[PDB]
Structure 1
Amino acid sequence: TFVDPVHEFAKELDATNISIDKVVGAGEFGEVCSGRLKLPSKKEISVAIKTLKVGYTEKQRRDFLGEASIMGQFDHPNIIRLEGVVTKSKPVMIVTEYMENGSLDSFLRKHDAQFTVIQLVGMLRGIASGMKYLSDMGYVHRDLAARNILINSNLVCKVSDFGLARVIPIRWTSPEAIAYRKFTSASDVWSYGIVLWEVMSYGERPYWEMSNQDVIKAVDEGYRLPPPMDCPAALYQLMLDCWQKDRNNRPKFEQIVSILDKLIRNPGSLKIITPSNLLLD
Structure 2
Amino acid sequence: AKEIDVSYVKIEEVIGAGEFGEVCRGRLKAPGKKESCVAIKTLERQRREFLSEASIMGQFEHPNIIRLEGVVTNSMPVMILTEFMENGALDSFLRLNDGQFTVIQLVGMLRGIASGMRYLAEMSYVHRDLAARNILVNSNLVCKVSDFGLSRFIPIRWTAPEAIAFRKFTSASDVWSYGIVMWEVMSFGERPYWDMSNQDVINAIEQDYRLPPPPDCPTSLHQLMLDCWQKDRNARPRFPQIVSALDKMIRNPASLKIVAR
Q: Which residue of 2 aligns with 1:215?
A: 201
Q: Which residue of 1 aligns with 2:241?
A: 255
- Kindly state the Cα deviation for residue 163 of structure 1 after the two structures are TM-superposed: 4.5
Q: Which residue of 1 aligns with 2:102?
A: 116
- Which secondary structure does the structure 1 equivalent of 2:23 belong to? strand
TM-score under structure 1 length normalisation: 0.88
- Kindly state the Cα deviation for residue 66 of structure 1 after the two structures are TM-superposed: 1.9
2:189 maps to 1:203: yes
2:129 maps to 1:143: yes
In 1: Cα distance, 2:245 partner to 2:66 partner:
23
Q: Which residue of 2 aligns with 1:36?
A: 27
Deviations 1:107-144 (A, max 9, x none): 00111111000110011000000000000000000000
In 1: Cα distance, 2:164 partner to 2:214 partner:
25
2:35 aligned partner, one-letter code: E
- Kindly state the Cα deviation for residue 269 of structure 1 after the two structures are TM-superposed: 1.1
Q: Which residue of 2 aligns with 1:237?
A: 223
In 1: Cα distance, 2:115 partner to 2:104 partner:
16
- Kindly state the Cα deviation for residue 43 of structure 1 after the two structures are TM-superposed: 2.5
- Which secondary structure does the structure 2 equivalent of 1:32 belong to? strand
Q: Which residue of 2 aligns with 1:63?
A: 49
Q: Which moved more, 1:189-198 or 1:261-270?
A: 261-270
Q: Which moved more, 1:41-50 or 1:94-103?
A: 41-50
Deviations 1:212-253 (A, max 9, x none): 122111101100111101110010000000000000100010
Q: CA RMSD in A?
A: 1.4
In 2: Cα distance, 1:133 partner to 1:206 partner:
25
The partner residue of 1:15 within 6, 22, 25 is 6
In 2: Cα distance, 1:95 partner to 1:262 partner:
36
TM-score under structure 2 length normalisation: 0.94
- Which secondary structure does the structure 1 equivalent of 2:224 belong to? helix
- Say whether the 8 Å CA contact 1:77–1:130 is kept in structure 2: yes
2:41 aligned partner, one-letter code: K
How is 1:52-91 mapped onto 2 (pairs within 5 angstroms)? 52=43, 56-59=44-47, 62-91=48-77
2:255 maps to 1:264: no
Residues 1:67 and 1:143: Cα distance change in structure 2 (over 3 Å): same
In 2: Cα distance, 1:125 partner to 1:57 partner:
41
Q: Which residue of 1 aligns with 2:36?
A: 45
In 2: Cα distance, 1:75 partner to 1:253 partner:
17
In 2: Cα distance, 1:117 partner to 1:65 partner:
39
- Say whether the 8 Å CA contact 1:194–1:206 is kept in structure 2: yes
In 1: Cα distance, 2:75 partner to 2:242 partner:
44
Instruction: Give the gaps of 5 or more residues in structure 1.
Output: 1-9, 275-281
Q: Which residue of 1 aligns with 2:167?
A: 181
The partner residue of 1:171 within 141, 144, 157 is 157
2:29 aligned partner, one-letter code: K
- Kindly state the Cα deviation for residue 162 of structure 1 after the two structures are TM-superposed: 6.5
In 2: Cα distance, 1:229 partner to 1:58 partner:
51
Deviations 1:28-47 (A, max 9, x none): 32112212212343322221
- Say whether the 8 Å CA contact 2:134–2:148 is kept in structure 1: no
- Which secondary structure does the structure 1 equivalent of 2:80 belong to? strand
In 2: Cα distance, 1:154 partner to 1:145 partner:
20
In 2: Cα distance, 1:112 partner to 1:182 partner:
35
- Kindly state the Cα deviation for residue 181 of structure 1 after the two structures are TM-superposed: 0.6
In 1: Cα distance, 2:207 partner to 2:95 partner:
30
2:50 aligned partner, one-letter code: F
2:235 maps to 1:246: no
2:4 aligned partner, one-letter code: L
In 1: Cα distance, 2:96 partner to 2:232 partner:
36
Deviations 1:158-212 (A, max 9, x none): 0001659xxx521010000011111110000000000000000111111122121
Q: Percent identity?
A: 78
